[PDB]
């Protein structure tokens, strides 16, 4: 067959994800940023759906790259900019998810402080800080993405120890810290809400928390798992071939979180649900 079964699955899931995510993110961003005003609650949804929309718009670049070889018939500066933008939007998405969890826990546990010192400007400031951190962690991509060989968008590592450092920082700051922070925040939220003052929202909160965390896990675990699996030992073994084969499905699963996020996050409030229904 011209395309391997894993390649076929990756291509079809990428196409479906690109279409669905483009539609959903476009609708969410349009509605929230045109029809409704920017309150404290909608700022997080706006920024997360913006990152998801950028990821979904960059996805067709991956679709075009993943056809014959991937020798990048697009240039050098574009070869140096596209991967940086892709990594920026993906990690901005995960960081904004972590920020949303932190904000929810802070709202629940210290209502006075959020009421008396938290507003739209503070949310914009912290969101801008999140974007800056994402850009900083994607700076290595910009300074190393290049059409180096070009006879192939090689990743510059001028086994490379800098590759070890890059993979370590990526894994840590993109998976471990956000996962622990989000898990602790949602666990504390549900533990506090199990204090009999919350008799009409414990079930919905529990379902949303478990759904969000399990979706995040099943979407991002394969990515860094294979990232560290193919980085150890010579892939000449059958395991190395296997992980190389699953790499496409791994990046597909990583990207699909962008399309899964809007339904789970923005299309939960009753007001936003009504606004989306009216706009459609």
């Amino acid at each position: 067959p011209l395309f391997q079964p894993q390649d076929i699955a990756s291509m079809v899931i990428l196409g479906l994800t690109c279409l669905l995510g483009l539609l959903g993110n476009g609708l969410v961003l349009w509605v929230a940023g045109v029809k409704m005003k920017t309150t404290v609650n909608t700022v997080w949804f706006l920024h997360l759906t913006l990152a998801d929309f950028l990821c979904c718009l960059s996805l067709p670049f991956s679709l075009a790259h993943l056809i014959l070889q991937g020798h990048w018939p697009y240039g050098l500066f574009l070869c140096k900019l596209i991967p940086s933008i892709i990594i920026l939007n993906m990690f901005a998405s995960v960081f904004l998810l972590t920020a949303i969890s932190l904000d929810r826990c802070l709202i629940v546990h210290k209502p006075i402080w959020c009421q008396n010192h938290r507003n739209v400007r503070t949310a914009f400031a912290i969101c801008g800080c999140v974007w800056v951190v994402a850009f900083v962690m994607c700076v290595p991509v910009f300074v190393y993405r290049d059409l180096f060989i070009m006879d192939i968008c090689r990743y510059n590592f001028d086994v490379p120890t800098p590759l070890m450092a890059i993979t370590i920082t990526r894994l840590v700051v993109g998976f471990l810290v956000p996962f622990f922070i989000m898990v602790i925040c949602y666990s504390l939220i549900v533990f506090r809400m199990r204090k009999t003052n919350f008799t009409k929202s414990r079930n919905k909160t529990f379902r949303v928390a478990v759904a969000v965390v399990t979706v995040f896990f099943i979407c991002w675990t394969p990515y860094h798992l294979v990232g560290v699996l193919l980085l150890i030992t010579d892939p000449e073994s059958s395991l190395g071939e296997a992980v190389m084969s699953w790499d496409h499905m791994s990046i597909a699963l990583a990207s699909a979180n962008s399309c899964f996020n809007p339904f789970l996050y923005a299309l939960l409030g009753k007001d936003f649900r009504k606004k989306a229904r009216q706009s459609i």
Partner: peptide, 8 residues
């Protein structure tokens, strides 16, 4: 250096 698929 083998070619790399985008993403990582």
């Amino acid at each position: 250096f083998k070619p790399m698929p985008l993403x990582r």
